[PDB]
Design a protein around this ligand. Structure first.
Ligand SMILES: Nc1nc2c(ncn2[C@@H]2O[C@H](COP(=O)(O)OP(=O)(O)OP(=O)(O)O)[C@@H](O)[C@H]2O)c(=O)[nH]1
Ligand SMILES: Nc1ncnc2c1ncn2[C@@H]1O[C@H](COP(=O)(O)OP(=O)(O)CP(=O)(O)O)[C@@H](O)[C@H]1O
Ligand SMILES: COc1cc(C(=O)c2c[nH]c(-c3cccc4[nH]ccc34)n2)cc(OC)c1OC
Ligand SMILES: Nc1nc2c(ncn2[C@@H]2O[C@H](COP(=O)(O)OP(=O)(O)O)[C@@H](O)[C@H]2O)c(=O)[nH]1
Ligand SMILES: [Ca+2]
Ligand SMILES: [Mg+2]
Ligand SMILES: [Mg+2]
Ligand SMILES: [Mg+2]
Lengths: 437, 54, 427, 327
């Protein structure tokens, strides 16, 4: 067993962290006070779930997690929420004033006041680890803290933990639930600074989640809570291999080995099915073939894009529920004849499959119906670069006029960092075209 | 399709299907940059305060 | 995240008192400072504008300033005048006589230190100071001259806080004196450099709305200030009530101001009502969005179709479909493509608040950063130059020590501001 | 009320689509870089398909199918036909072609023809299995294709021609064949001996500037060509030729439908195609090439460009000359 430490930065990172850890507790039978009756080794253990939970002598199972935000509103709700007993107070770190949607404020002005404290609190968790393998970092692209502080933290983690893997769960900005007009700026700035420090990043486009909630959960106006419960199901599906018995994706290094053959192209596309409303009174349970075929519909993807016009470098199928390999293989055989699945010439055309027999867990009172089988596909396809093209174009429109740039220069940033960041994004799009076209 | 490396346990199983074969900065330089941006803030503020003093 | 409110001069204290009346009712605060409210959305962000004194009493974080004692006394005698802290009344005895130089250089300098002591006392109680909000007119002497002197000194002591103003522009349709274009031009010179966001409350537009739209043949200041208080309630709603945006003065400036000097906003409001009027039919969402964007509903006498919107912030108040609001808001952008800049993606933002203002079930408030605001500054520049080319009435100012060069520079800066707004209109 | 953007001003067909939609009064044109449009009339290369379909509250449509280039480029078409079982190497309506790069061991077919004792090909026309030598001298991916040595020759004139068919595919992947085709004639009698001069061998309108002798603009329409086939050959255009043309068009577009369809996509596509056919002496139809950005014929611009508005545009944004090829 090797421990993983989760770090949740900014509002989006914290609130998605709340949803994930709530889901983790329900999946492992951990009560809101941290007690887990099924855990028979009191006060310690090396079980698979101990990758995410340490244990106190009193039998309390505490998340290996740090929450960071530059203002206190969001984390205070964790301090007073249903799972307030779950977290030790030093795991919840707040400042007094946020980055005001400004990467420069979160990265330079304010983040510099709190970075040493956060690393100290992170080091406390690492000292409880017998074999720490790395970090899972949750944050938004568009927020000043989620963008600016995260990139500062990731640089320092490379310094302090040079041989530890770092994975990201990143919220890609969407106008439907946007909070700032400068979110394209923050996204490009943080991607440039973080690119070398992240081994694998799962981007979630709020536009995709918003539309999935509208179309499949019949929610007219999805809230953050609607989005985050869906996101946490996909995150839990992705991390399940670290928390349960299995042979596939058993350590952070395996995510990079299995999904990322080239370091800069480390943004796998997640696709999840089925998403079914709890309110739907009559539902026909979807077969292995149906949920597997749904993995190749852009409407079910975490980012809207067309994988038919890109190339695959790796493909992982993560099933939960009533699924046996024979049916997966039959489903894959049919799907391959009828769909456009092109791998690069230097990679084999193959799927790595993991099956957990437990069907997905749903939060009581939530919007997701209970299903007998579900799947999350992780594919590394060049088609995800469409998201970079969209982001870089919005960046270009504003930066050509230097609109809003003075807010960043005023915090000590230089105009040269904008174009240096933009050149790196330009190189990233070129990398994706060379591999995919 | 070739099914390889099938591993089974009580919790589930995993395998791989093949359809076709193939064909960082130091701490000092971080503090360098955090301090160079801070001095640019202090310079811009000192210029404002010099302007307000005139 | 506390805001410190300052009201200076007759106009500033008049619209300032009305602002505190309106929002105290919205938050369930009675004239004695006691809370008597149904909903707890009324108190979640009450600290933004109110200090909580011992005894569960809320006192406005407000400082009341004038070189003239009379208007101050009328505030104290007002319906909510007893709610203000008595130590926060700072007044002189002279009066500025509609003279910017007296407010800024002579009579005002004597009183400005006393105001800063109250500002400092209020700031030291603040958990985390957002910044400052000033109400004043630009046509007089105290709110204009001393108000901008206050702004400069506050920026000296709080260089990292936001400075927000509600600035009433002079108009000959309401005019109190001939020198108002002088006072306004000198003031705009200060506001361009020393505020982060300024709401342009145009007395020309306020008069035209009362006369043409509300069918008031003889509009009074009470009629004008009725529009001002409705506007001030709307543009501060996202600061006073919990929202998905969690707005504050800094986030507003970051998202509304693409270029530092272009920070003068055109407010808009719907539905437009006169005081005591009957509002029996609620507006529908299509009506709210259409009216709020109508030139007749703008609080600055500028034609929105004579420029382009750089950014727009809109807050809808009441029980309504947020889905329908988004549809109508996205719809008005499509049908008026040419009046929004193409190079700022997602430059029109919408927010919703469940609590409607008093007397209405549905309202909509609009904050626009439009290049058409240059029409306002052009209008004042023309009135300035008509007198200045003959040096008319300058002796009132040179008598207080001012030089004509200072007038030339203020005029030149405002004309530069006009040219800057014009540059992005063609972009 | 709708809005659109024009990013290919050099497009003759969509220059008229621009004017027709503006004259409707219910369509407003924006600047070419305004992304809040309903319909993009996109550029011919590097159209930013990745930026489409991400505008909230806006249904977006584009006049191009992403991935249709696999059908509208000479080298990829030969690839597409040989790699696809629906078409196959045994495909009976495409001339035997090979991709020679500057699969060049194709001579086993050419050198089997000399062992079997006709073997003239095209890239450009010669019989000695070498021009190859002109393909290396040009330095671009070229296609070597069997030359149809026995074409159908119109009388009077002994002339050669090709047939252009305009095909509209809408957002629902309905395949609409424009009922009006055109024959691009040759005015020079076909000389089976001297392939050097290619004005009797290349029916391209430009390659003919004797031009204009038999019919106007070297363009014969379907009514006359039908009358010719009746008077001269005792058959009709529908039976002898158009049945094969409809089969080829449907076969080609059905093959690539899974790769290019926008059925469940966040944006929608339509595209106008130009199929070029040759007719041999037996009245057997051969597919020559597919045009991704086709120009129309002068007389037919008004009717075709209208029909584009009715079926491809106003069907998505509400305000026949087409044969629907059913599948
Ligand atoms: N899916 C999801 N997205 C969120 C959530 N909260 C915020 N976002 C998105 O994140 C972006 C804004 O960044 P935030 O995380 O809210 O800002 P922050 O990290 O706290 O940084 P500052 O507030 O500027 O100091 C917007 O695009 C929001 O749509 C959330 O709970 N779930
Ligand atoms: N295998 C073949 N056999 C006989 N003739 C052929 C032929 N391939 C092409 N041709 C002739 O050459 C001429 C031009 O062929 P091709 O279609 O490749 O050029 P092009 O791309 O300019 C047509 P368009 O202008 O419509 O795009 C045709 O008119 C045809 O008569
Ligand atoms: C929407 O309405 C309001 C917002 C704000 C505000 O702080 C904010 C944050 N982002 C934005 C914003 C502004 C413009 C374009 C944008 N694209 C994405 C965000 C955004 N504006 C403040 C208000 O009143 C004080 C207010 O009411 C009117
Ligand atoms: N809208 C409005 N404008 C006012 C009011 N009182 C004065 N003004 C305007 O303010 C200008 C005069 O400035 P004033 O505030 O009276 O002088 P001060 O006391 O020295 O600041 C003139 O343009 C008036 O039209 C008021 O109550 N409402
Ligand atoms: Ca244990
Ligand atoms: Mg925040
Ligand atoms: Mg007065
Ligand atoms: Mg061609």
């Amino acid at each position: 067993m090797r421990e993983c430490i989760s770090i949740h930065v900014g509002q989006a990172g914290v609130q998605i962290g709340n949803a994930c850890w709530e889901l983790y507790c329900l999946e492992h039978g951990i009560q809101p006070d941290g007690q887990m009756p099924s855990d028979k080794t009191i006060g310690g253990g090396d079980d698979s779930f101990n990758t995410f939970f340490s244990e106190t002598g009193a039998g309390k199972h505490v998340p290996r997690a740090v929450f960071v935000d530059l203002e206190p509103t969001v984390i205070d709700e964790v301090r007073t929420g249903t799972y307030r007993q779950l977290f030790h107070p030093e795991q919840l770190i707040t400042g007094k004033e946020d980055a005001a949607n400004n990467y420069a404020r979160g990265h330079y002005t304010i983040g510099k006041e709190i970075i040493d404290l956060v690393l100290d609190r992170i080091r406390k968790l690492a000292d409880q680890c017998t074999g720490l393998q790395g970090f899972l970092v949750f944050h938004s692209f568009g927020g000043g803290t989620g963008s600016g502080f995260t990139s500062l933290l990731m640089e320092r983690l490379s310094v302090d933990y040079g041989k530890k893997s770092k994975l990201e769960f990143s919220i890609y900005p969407a106008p439907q639930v946007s909070t700032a007009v400068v979110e394209p700026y923050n996204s490009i700035l943080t991607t440039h600074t973080t690119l070398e420090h992240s081994d694998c990043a799962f981007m979630v486009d709020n536009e995709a989640i918003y539309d999935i909630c509208r179309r499949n959960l019949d929610i007219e106006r999805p809230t953050y809570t609607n989005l985050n419960r869906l996101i946490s199901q996909i995150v839990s599906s992705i991390t399940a291999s670290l928390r349960f018995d299995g042979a596939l994706n058993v350590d952070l290094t395996e995510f990079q080995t299995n999904l990322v053959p080239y370091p800069r192209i480390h943004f796998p596309l997640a696709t999840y099915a089925p998403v079914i409303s709890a309110e739907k009174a009559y539902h026909e349970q979807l077969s292995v073939a149906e949920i597997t075929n749904a993995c190749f519909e852009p409407a079910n993807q975490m980012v809207k894009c067309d994988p038919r016009h890109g190339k695959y470098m790796a493909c992982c199928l993560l099933y939960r529920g009533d699924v046996v390999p024979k049916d997966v293989n039959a489903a894959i055989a049919t799907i391959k004849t009828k769909r456009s699945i092109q791998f690069v010439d230097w990679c084999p055309t193959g799927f790595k499959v993991g099956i957990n027999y437990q069907p997905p867990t749903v939060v009581p009172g939530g919007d997701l119906a209970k299903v007998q089988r579900a799947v999350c596909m992780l594919s590394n396809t060049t088609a995800i670069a469409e998201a970079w093209a969209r982001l870089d174009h919005k960046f270009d429109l504003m930066y050509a006029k230097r609109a809003f740039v003075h807010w960043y220069v005023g915090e000590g940033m230089e105009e040269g960092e904008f174009s240096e960041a933009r050149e790196d994004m330009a190189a990233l799009e070129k990398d994706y075209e060379e591999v995919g076209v | 399709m070739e099914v390889i490396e099938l591993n089974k346990c009580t919790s589930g199983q995993s395998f791989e299907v093949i359809l076709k074969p193939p064909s960082d900065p130091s701490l000092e330089e971080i503090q360098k940059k955090l301090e160079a941006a801070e001095e640019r803030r202090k310079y811009q503020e000192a210029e404002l305060l010099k302007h307000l003093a005139e | 995240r506390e805001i410190v409110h300052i009201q200076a001069g007759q106009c500033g204290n008049q619209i300032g008192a009305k602002f505190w009346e309106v929002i105290s009712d919205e938050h369930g605060i009675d004239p004695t400072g006691s809370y008597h409210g149904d909903s707890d959305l009324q108190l979640e962000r009450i600290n933004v504008y109110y200090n909580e004194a011992t005894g569960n009493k809320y006192v406005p974080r407000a400082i009341l300033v004038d070189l003239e004692p009379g208007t101050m006394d009328s505030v104290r005698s007002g319906p909510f005048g007893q709610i203000f802290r008595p130590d926060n009344f700072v007044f002189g005895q002279s009066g500025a006589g509609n003279n910017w130089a007296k407010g800024h250089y002579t009579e005002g300098a004597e009183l400005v230190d006393s105001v800063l002591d109250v500002v400092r006392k209020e700031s030291e109680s603040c958990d985390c100071l957002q910044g400052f909000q000033l109400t004043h007119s630009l046509g007089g002497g105290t709110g204009s001259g001393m108000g901008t002197l206050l702004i400069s000194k506050i920026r000296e002591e709080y260089p990292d806080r936001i400075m927000n103003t509600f600035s009433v522009m002079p108009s000959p349709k309401v005019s109190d004196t001939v020198v108002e274009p002088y006072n306004a031009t000198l003031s705009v010179h200060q506001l361009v450099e020393n505020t982060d966001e300024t709401y342009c409350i145009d007395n020309e537009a306020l008069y035209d709305i009362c006369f043409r739209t509300l069918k008031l043949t003889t509009p009074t200041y009470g009629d004008l200030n009725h529009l001002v208080s409705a506007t001030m309630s709307g543009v501060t709603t996202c600061l006073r009530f919990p929202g998905q945006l969690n707005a504050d003065l800094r986030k507003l400036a970051v998202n509304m101001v693409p270029f530092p000097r272009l920070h003068f906003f055109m407010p808009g409001f719907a539905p437009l009502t006169s005081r005591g009027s009957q509002q029996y039919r609620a507006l529908t969402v299509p009506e709210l969005t259409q009216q709020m964007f109508d030139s007749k509903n703008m609080m600055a006498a500028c034609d929105p179709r004579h420029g382009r919107y750089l950014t727009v912030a809109a807050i809808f108040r009441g029980r309504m479909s947020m889905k329908e609001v988004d549809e109508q808001m996205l719809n008005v952008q499509n049908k008026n493509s040419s009046y929004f800049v193409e190079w700022i993606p997602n430059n029109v933002k919408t927010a919703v608040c469940d609590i409607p203002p008093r007397g209405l079930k549905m309202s909509a408030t609009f904050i626009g950063n439009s290049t058409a605001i240059q029409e306002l500054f052009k209008r004042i520049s023309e009135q300035f130059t008509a007198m200045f080319r003959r040096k008319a009435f300058l002796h009132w100012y040179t008598g207080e020590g001012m030089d004509e060069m200072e007038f030339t520079e203020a005029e030149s800066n405002m004309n530069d501001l006009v040219s800057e707004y014009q540059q992005y209109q063609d972009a | 009320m709708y809005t659109f953007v024009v990013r290919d001003e050099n497009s003759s067909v969509y220059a008229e689509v621009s004017r027709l939609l503006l004259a409707t009064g219910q369509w407003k044109r924006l600047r070419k870089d305004n992304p809040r449009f309903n319909l993009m009339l996109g550029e011919r290369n590097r159209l930013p398909f990745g930026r489409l379909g991400h505008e909230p509250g806006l249904v977006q449509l584009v006049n191009y199918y992403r991935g249709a280039d696999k059908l509208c480029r000479k080298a990829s078409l030969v690839k597409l036909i040989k790699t696809s079982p629906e078409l196959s190497e045994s495909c009976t309506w495409f001339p035997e072609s090979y991709v020679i790069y500057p699969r060049e061991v194709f001579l086993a077919a050419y050198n089997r023809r000399r062992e079997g004792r006709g073997n003239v090909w095209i890239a450009l026309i010669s019989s000695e299995a070498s021009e190859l030598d002109f393909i290396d001298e040009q330095g671009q991916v070229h296609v070597i294709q069997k030359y149809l040595e026995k074409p159908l020759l119109l009388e009077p004139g002994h002339r050669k021609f090709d047939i252009r068919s305009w095909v509209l595919v809408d957002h629902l992947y309905n395949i609409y064949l424009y009922r009006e085709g055109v024959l691009r004639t040759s005015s020079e009698p076909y000389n089976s001996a001297n392939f050097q001069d290619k004005t009797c061998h290349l029916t391209n309108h430009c390659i003919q500037k004797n031009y204009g002798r038999y019919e106007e603009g070297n363009e014969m329409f379907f009514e006359e060509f039908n009358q010719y086939l009746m008077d001269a050959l005792n058959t009709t255009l529908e039976n002898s030729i158009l049945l094969q043309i409809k089969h080829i068009i449907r076969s080609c577009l059905m093959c690539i439908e899974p790769a290019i369809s926008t059925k469940h996509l966040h944006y929608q596509s339509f595209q106008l195609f130009g199929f070029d056919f040759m007719v041999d002496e037996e009245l057997k139809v051969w597919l020559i090439e597919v045009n991704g950005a086709p120009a129309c014929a002068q007389k037919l611009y008004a009717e075709l460009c209208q029909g584009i508005v009715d079926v491809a545009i106003s069907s998505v944004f509400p305000l026949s000359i087409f044969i629907k090829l059913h599948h």
